[PDB]
Every structure is written in C-alpha cells, then in structure tokens.
Amino acid sequence: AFEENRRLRNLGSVEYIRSENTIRILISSDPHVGYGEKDPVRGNDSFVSFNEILEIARERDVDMILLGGDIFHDNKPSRKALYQALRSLRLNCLGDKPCELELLSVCNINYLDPNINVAIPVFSIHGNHDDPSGRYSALDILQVTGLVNYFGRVPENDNIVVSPILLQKGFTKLALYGISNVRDERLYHSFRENKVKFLRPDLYRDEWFNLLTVHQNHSAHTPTSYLPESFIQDFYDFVLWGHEHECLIDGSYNPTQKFTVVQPGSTIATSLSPGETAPKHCGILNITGKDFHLEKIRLRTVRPFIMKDIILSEVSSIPPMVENKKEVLTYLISKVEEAITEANAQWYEAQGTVPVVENEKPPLPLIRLRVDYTGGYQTENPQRFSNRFVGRVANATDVVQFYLKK
Amino acid sequence: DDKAFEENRRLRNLGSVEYIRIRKNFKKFQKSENTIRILISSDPHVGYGEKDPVRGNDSFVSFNEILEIARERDVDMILLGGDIFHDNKPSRKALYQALRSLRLNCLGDKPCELELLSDTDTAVCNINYLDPNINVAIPVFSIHGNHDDPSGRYSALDILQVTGLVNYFGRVPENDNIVVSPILLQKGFTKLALYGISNVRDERLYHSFRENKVKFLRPDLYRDEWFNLLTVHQNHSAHTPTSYLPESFIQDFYDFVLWGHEHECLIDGSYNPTQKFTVVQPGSTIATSLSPGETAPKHCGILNITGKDFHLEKIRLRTVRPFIMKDIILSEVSSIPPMVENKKEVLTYLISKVEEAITEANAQWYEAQGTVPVVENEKPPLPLIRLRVDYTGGYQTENPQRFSNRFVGRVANATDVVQFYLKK
Numbered sequence: 001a002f003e004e005n006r007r008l009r010n011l012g013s014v015e016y017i018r019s020e021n022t023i024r025i026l027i028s029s030d031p032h033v034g035y036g037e038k039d040p041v042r043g044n045d046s047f048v049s050f051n052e053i054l055e056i057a058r059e060r061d062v063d064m065i066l067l068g069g070d071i072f073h074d075n076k077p078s079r080k081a082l083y084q085a086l087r088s089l090r091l092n093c094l095g096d097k098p099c100e101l102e103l104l105s106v107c108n109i110n111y112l113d114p115n116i117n118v119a120i121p122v123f124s125i126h127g128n129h130d131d132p133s134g135r136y137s138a139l140d141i142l143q144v145t146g147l148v149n150y151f152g153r154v155p156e157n158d159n160i161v162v163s164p165i166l167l168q169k170g171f172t173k174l175a176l177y178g179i180s181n182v183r184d185e186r187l188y189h190s191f192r193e194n195k196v197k198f199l200r201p202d203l204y205r206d207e208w209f210n211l212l213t214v215h216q217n218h219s220a221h222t223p224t225s226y227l228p229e230s231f232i233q234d235f236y237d238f239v240l241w242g243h244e245h246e247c248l249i250d251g252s253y254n255p256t257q258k259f260t261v262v263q264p265g266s267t268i269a270t271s272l273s274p275g276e277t278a279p280k281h282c283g284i285l286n287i288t289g290k291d292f293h294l295e296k297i298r299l300r301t302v303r304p305f306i307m308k309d310i311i312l313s314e315v316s317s318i319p320p321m322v323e324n325k326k327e328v329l330t331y332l333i334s335k336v337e338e339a340i341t342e343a344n345a346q347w348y349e350a351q352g353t354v355p356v357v358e359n360e361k362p363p364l365p366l367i368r369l370r371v372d373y374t375g376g377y378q379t380e381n382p383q384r385f386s387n388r389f390v391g392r393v394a395n396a397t398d399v400v401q402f403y404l405k406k
Numbered sequence: 407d408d409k410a411f412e413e414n415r416r417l418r419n420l421g422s423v424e425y426i427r428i429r430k431n432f433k434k435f436q437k438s439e440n441t442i443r444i445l446i447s448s449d450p451h452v453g454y455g456e457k458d459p460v461r462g463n464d465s466f467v468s469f470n471e472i473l474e475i476a477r478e479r480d481v482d483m484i485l486l487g488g489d490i491f492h493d494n495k496p497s498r499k500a501l502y503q504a505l506r507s508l509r510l511n512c513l514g515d516k517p518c519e520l521e522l523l524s525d526t527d528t529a530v531c532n533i534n535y536l537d538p539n540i541n542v543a544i545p546v547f548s549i550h551g552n553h554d555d556p557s558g559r560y561s562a563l564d565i566l567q568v569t570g571l572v573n574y575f576g577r578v579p580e581n582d583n584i585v586v587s588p589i590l591l592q593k594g595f596t597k598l599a600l601y602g603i604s605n606v607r608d609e610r611l612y613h614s615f616r617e618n619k620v621k622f623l624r625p626d627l628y629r630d631e632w633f634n635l636l637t638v639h640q641n642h643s644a645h646t647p648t649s650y651l652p653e654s655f656i657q658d659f660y661d662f663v664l665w666g667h668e669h670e671c672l673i674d675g676s677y678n679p680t681q682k683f684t685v686v687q688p689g690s691t692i693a694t695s696l697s698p699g700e701t702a703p704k705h706c707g708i709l710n711i712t713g714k715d716f717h718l719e720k721i722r723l724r725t726v727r728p729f730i731m732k733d734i735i736l737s738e739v740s741s742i743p744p745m746v747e748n749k750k751e752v753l754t755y756l757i758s759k760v761e762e763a764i765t766e767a768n769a770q771w772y773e774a775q776g777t778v779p780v781v782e783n784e785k786p787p788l789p790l791i792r793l794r795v796d797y798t799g800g801y802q803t804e805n806p807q808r809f810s811n812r813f814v815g816r817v818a819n820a821t822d823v824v825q826f827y828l829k830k
C-alpha cells in the first residue's frame with residue numbers, strides 16, 4: 001500500500017479553459033495566532049511573531065504575501081487573537097505603495113478595491129484546526145475586511161476544482177493555485193478516484209510559473225493519511241507546503257515531477273517535538289520568468305528551543321550502577337545549563353548582537369532533555385526536576401523525559 | 407424606596423463641569439453646507455435569534471437597512487447608542503455580516519464635510535475618515551453597550567474599530583473616576599460637541615454621580631457655540647431607586663441626549679423643561695423579547711443640526727417583522743360563562759383575537775412598505791403575535807404549544823402565541 005503510492009503519478013484530471021519583471025513573494029505558514037494565549041510566559045508569542053512576518057514583508061518591499069494556512073490556531077479565535085491579527089494586517093499591508101501585480105483572472109481581489117489602499121496583498125488557504133467547529137470561518141472574516149485574500153476554497157471534498165489566480169509583473173507570469181486543508185484520508189481518496197480537476201489557461205501554456213499551495217501531512221504512519229508528492233501534477237514548478245511545523249525552508253527538488261517543495265514551517269512551536277527545534281524562518285521567493293531565487297530569513301522573535309538526547313551509561317562522570325540519584329541530578333542540571341547557553345547563543349545570532357549590558361537580553365528558552373536511563377540509574381519525578389528552572393526556562397512542565405531503550 | 411425616588415428628582419447637574427484648552431472634504435484618503443445630518447439609531451443586536459428557522463436572518467437584514475438608509479439619504483455620519491452585537495462573543499456569521507454591511511454602506515468616494523477640531527497605542531487611526539488608506543464616506547460613531555452573555559480586555563466593538571469601520575467613543579476604563587471628553591466636529595458655521603458614556607452597571611454609575619466622580623470637559627473655544635450631544639446606554643427607569651440614570655443628574659449644558667439600551671421606540675423625543683434638553687430613545691431595530699415595549703413600530707431618525715437648533719426626521723423601518731400584542735382579562739369579557747366547563751368558549755374568543763392581531767400585523771407591514779395587498783406586490787413576513795391572558799374568575803385553559811400549533815405557518819413564533827396567568 002506504501003509501495004503503490006510511489007508508482008501512482010499525476011493523479012486527477014487537467015482541463016484547459018480560458019525588478020519591474022521580478023515577482024517578490026514573502027512565503028510563510030502556520031503562525032497559529034492565539035496559541036498558548038493563557039500561558040503567563042508564552043502568552044504574547046503568536047501575536048509578536050505573526051506581526052514580524054508582516055513587518056519583514058513591508059521592510060523588504062515585497063509584492064505579495066503567500067501563506068500555507070493556519071493564520072489562527074483555533075476555529076473560533078478569542079477576541080484578542082482576532083484583534084491582534086487585524087491590527088498587524090492593517091498596519092503592515094495598507095499604504096501608498098503601488099501594486100505592480102496585474103490581475104488577468106468583498107470577494108474580489110483586495111488590492112483591486114477603490115475604497116482600500118492595499119500596498120501588499122496577503123494570499124492564504126484554509127488550514128486544519130482541532131478545537132470544536134456554520135458556513136463562516138475566521139478566514140472569511142479576514143477576507144470581508146479587505147485585509148486577506150482567501151483562495152483555494154474546497155466546498156466539496158468529493159469533486160475538487162483547482163482554478164488559478166493569474167498574476168503578471170513585466171514579462172513574468174504567475175499561475176497561483178491552492179487547495180485548502182481537506183481531511184488527509186479524504187483527499188488521498190479524491191486523487192485515487194480521479195475527483196481532482198486542475199484548470200490551466202489555454203493561452204501562454206508554457207509561460208506561467210506554476211505555484212501550488214497545500215496544507216496537508218507530508219508523511220504519516222498509515223499509507224492513506226498524507227499527500228504523496230507523486231500525486232501532484234508535474235506541470236507545477238513550485239509547491240508551498242503548509243501544516244508541517246518543521247522549518248525546511250531550503251527546499252527539496254523532486255527530479256521526476258520537476259518541481260521544488262518548500263516547507264517553511266510554523267512561526268511558533270506548538271509542541272516539544274524534535275521537528276520544532278529547527279530555527280524558524282520565512283522566505284522571499286523572487287520569481288523572474290521561469291527561474292527564481294529563494295532567500296531564507298531568520299525570525300528574530302521566536303523563542304529559542306533546544307532539545308538534547310542523553311545516554312546515562314555513556315556519561316563517564318556518573319557511576320554505574322549504584323544510587324547515582326545525586327550523580328544523575330548534577331549531570332542533568334549541567335546539561336540544562338549547557339542547553340540554556342546554546343539557546344541564548346542561538347538567540348543573539350538571530351539578533352546579530354553580543355551578550356553585553358547595553359544590549360537586550362534573550363527571552364526564557366524552551367528546553368527538553370530526552371534521557372535514556374537503562375541498566376541502571378536513579379530517576380527524579382519529571383515535574384520536580386522541571387521546578388528547578390522556574391525563571392530560567394519558558395516551559396514549567398516537560399523539561400525532562402525519562403525512558404528505557406526498546 | 408418612594409422617598410428615595412422623590413429625592414432623585416430634587417437633585418440635578420450631578421458631577422463636575424470644567425473647560426479645557428483646544429462640497430468641503432476632510433477625509434485623508436489618497437489614491438446644507440452648515441447643517442450636520444446624523445442618522446440616529448441604537449440596539450441592532452446583530453446575531454439575536456440566529457438559530458431560529460424563521461427569524462434567523464432578521465438582525466442582519468435590519469442592521470443593513472439602517473446603514474442603507476444612511477447612504478440613500480446622504481447623511482454626514484451615523485450615531486449609535488450601543489449594542490451593535492447581541493452577545494459579548496458574537497458568532498462568526500454575526501461578525502462577518504456586520505463587517506460586510508459596514509464596508510458596503512460606509513465606504514465610498516463621497517467627501518466627509520465634517521472637520522475634526524479635536525479628539526479629546528494609538529498606532530491605529532482613532533478617527534476612521536482621517537486614515538489615508540481607507541475611503542470612509544459615512545463615519546459610524548458608537549458607545550459600548552450591555553451584554554448578558556458570559557464575558558470571557560478586548561471587545562467585539564474594539565474589533566470593529568481596528569478594521570477602520572466604526573469609531574468606538576465614550577470609553578470607561580474606570581467606573582469610579584469617569585472623565586467625559588468631547589469629539590469636536592465642524593461643518594460650515596455649525597459646531598458639534600459629541601460626548602459619550604459607554605454602559606456602566608446602573609448601580610455603579612448612579613453612585614459615581616452621587617459621589618461627584620463624573621467629570622465633564624468643555625472646550626474653551628466657542629463656549630456657547632457648541633451644540634452639545636450626549637450618548638448613553640442605561641436604564642431610563644427601574645424598580646429600585648439606584649438601578650437607573652435619572653435625567654436630572656445629567657448636566658444642563660447638554661442640548662440633546664441619545665438614549666440607548668431601552669428597546670421601545672420613542673423616536674419623537676421628550677423635552678426636559680428644567681435641564682433644557684431633548685431626550686431621544688430611538689429603540690432597538692429588532693424585538694429581543696415579546697414585551698409590551700417591543701410592539702411600538704421600529705424607527706431610525708435623521709438629526710439635522712444648524713447652529714444651536716435641530717430638526718429630527720422620524721424614519722419607519724421596513725424590514726422589521728410586525729409584532730402585535732393583546733392583553734385579555736377573561737373576567738372583562740362576555741359572553742364567556744365563568745365557573746363552568748367553558749374550554750370551547752374561551753378558545754373560540756382567543757382564536758378570533760389571534761386572527762384579528764394577524765390582520766392588524768399585515769396592515770401594519772403594508773403601511774411601512776407603502777403598498778396594498780395585490781398579486782404583483784410582495785406578501786408580508788409571518789408576524790410575531792402574543793396574547794397575555796388573565797384567566798382569574800373560573801376559566802378553563804389550553805396548553806400554550808397546542809394553542810400556538812393552531813396557527814402553524816401563520817405566525818413567526820409558532821411555540822408561544824399565548825401566555826396564561828393569574829393577577830398577583
């Protein structure tokens with residue numbers, strides 16, 4: 001069943017119906033505005049980092065912003081989360097700057113409104129949400145204000161029609177496609193049953209730089225609970241991959257399909273997973289005809305997160321196998337202290353500063369120790385160990401996790 | 407209580423009043439010249455009765471109507487007495503619908519003839535039309551109202567302000583020390599000093615006036631040249647002598663008082679001869695309960711200000727579902743044989759009163775539309791009908807639901823058409 005997935009290529013059907021020349025796009029995904037709102041330390045993280053993304057777009061003078069979904073963490077965001085998102089979009093996206101993008105294709109393009117002066121149009125697809133969910137989303141609200149362009153709507157999970165937004169700047173032509181989040185198993189089934197219809201403009205067939213935006217699992221435990229890369233039509237040149245939190249901004253080239261996949265990652269860690277450790281970035285994609293150049297930009301406002309894997313039997317400072325309750329503590333405490341120094345150094349690197357009295361100090365970092373304690377060693381209560389770093393770490397819970405080798 | 411309500415009328419001009427140092431196009435968007443025209447309304451309660459199969463879209467249609475009349479009649483601004491939303495946390499549909507109506511009816515190329523003299527973060531534009539990136543044709547001004555929904559520092563009104571669609575004024579950070587500062591607006595020779603007090607728990611506000619903890623600020627320039635307008639959202643009357651705002655408490659320098667919160671349409675206004683102001687209670691644009699006060703046909707108004715004078719034009723709302731109520735005292739009826747098995751007689755009379763109320767409701771609707779009942783014309787929506795029946799004196803009743811079910815597809819409230827009670 002996993003073997004079958006590699007063999008299946010170009011699924012669904014393709015129908016044909018009706019830097020002045022460099023398209024600059026700020027690419028990001030998953031800001032999860034509102035996540036960890038009630039946390040005393042982490043409460044304002046999502047608001048600050050979502051603002052940063054829009055701030056970089058304005059400072060760097062990009063033509064547009066493209067997001068891979070999950071602007072909000074919840075289906076029903078709090079009044080604070082909604083207010084903060086709207087405030088950031090209004091202050092960073094409105095202005096006298098002319099929009100050099102020409103459209104060739106309340107609901108109509110925002111930067112096309114005569115009553116709204118949009119300097120940098122935001123384009124986003126709908127993402128996945130785990131809180132309890134009518135026919136009105138928080139993304140529909142962002143669209144109605146004229147601040148975000150909601151594209152890639154999936155009204156029916158059965159028959160999905162993928163139509164493009166056609167944009168031109170000088171000689172460079174962009175055919176922007178999107179598929180809003182669909183339950184992975186459902187989407188997988190739609191591609192297998194040939195229920196996904198891609199629409200291409202008849203004119204300038206080979207002229208349009210084809211960009212697809214998705215919000216799905218890139219991998220899964222079950223062979224039907226993710227979207228295989230081979231399923232995606234080979235006429236595409238670039239794929240922006242949302243939903244997946246790990247920053248893989250450098251990208252991966254698929255040699256068969258002939259298209260690059262860029263998984264930018266979230267702008268906030270939503271769990272203490274290994275995937276969340278990779279420093280967060282956004283990117284500037286510079287399209288110029290057929291080729292492009294992607295510039296990775298490190299996020300300055302994201303709280304550092306260091307994870308360390310420890311094997312006790314390998315620690316020459318600890319004696320085995322006795323009551324080393326004291327040995328394990330001293331050693332483990334020093335590893336947290338080492339992880340904090342690594343986190344602080346990672347933060348100053350992102351800022352371009354040095355640790356001195358005149359400079360701003362780093363925020364409390366997220367620290368996780370995965371400790372193998374086999375044959376044998378004395379362990380602590382994980383919560384009791386985590387209480388030791390009360391004003392040194394952002395995570396009051398889960399500083400340590402003890403495990404035995406399987 | 408009686409002695410305390412009496413003392414309320416004896417007291418006047420509560421608090422403290424001091425002075426503070428301060429077509430035409432005043433909008434900054436970049437891509438009756440002496441008469442300030444204001445569309446006045448209150449309490450649209452967007453989202454109320456959302457889940458009702460018949461009444462679900464009433465609040466959205468009527469809130470749109472108010473903004474639609476403002477645009478059609480070419481007013482300078484919209485002034486609301488609070489409660490744009492029914493809930494503290496409105497649904498996604500309610501918020502979407504309010505924003506859609508505001509964007510379509512208030513944005514446009516129409517020049518704003520109102521000059522902002524002084525507005526006594528902010529990273530955002532406090533005043534709407536002064537934003538160079540938003541083309542505001544008709545600025546909306548509103549105060550915060552009361553909500554019975556659980557309040558889980560950010561309001562839905564703050565969200566409307568942040569989009570640049572509504573100007574939230576008359577904020578009340580502290581209940582103890584309330585400072586009432588004006589928004590100063592000029593059109594030709596006409597000078598408007600606009601004041602607001604967002605809803606405060608009635609008992610708490612009453613105490614603030616008594617403890618002289620309410621400070622009113624007046625512009626030194628043009629002292630007796632401003633037309634003073636106050637916007638409130640409080641109970642105009644109450645059972646307890648401390649649970650409402652007495653008119654006498656409000657400073658007499660005011661010329662006009664827009665009274666929000668109260669749902670009954672009393673758009674004609676009342677003149678207070680001592681305080682020398684006119685109080686206008688416009689009423690809600692939707693019935694929130696089947697109360698006697700909700701029966702009076704709904705209106706909005708156009709307040710025309712020239713110098714220190716005003717003319718108010720009453721406008722009937724066409725989209726509001728008709729509501730007829732009848733109070734029936736069974737002992738005051740005949741021929742109803744009392745203290746006998748009179749179920750048939752009681753029912754026969756009550757059915758005829760519902761039929762009478764339906765005919766009255768339909769006639770009230772056609773009147774609001776300016777049409778006659780003919781095949782080419784639109785038919786009225788299902789009306790709200792309520793019978794409050796006193797059955798004291800020996801009278802047989804019927805289950806309210808079974809009685810209401812006799813009029814299926816004839817009334818909007820198919821569950822509670824009748825209410826049987828005994829006089830206390």
Ligand SMILES: [Mn+2]
Nearest residue numbers: 030070243244
């Ligand atoms: Mn996600």
Ligand SMILES: [Mn+2]
Nearest residue numbers: 449489667668
């Ligand atoms: Mn009310």
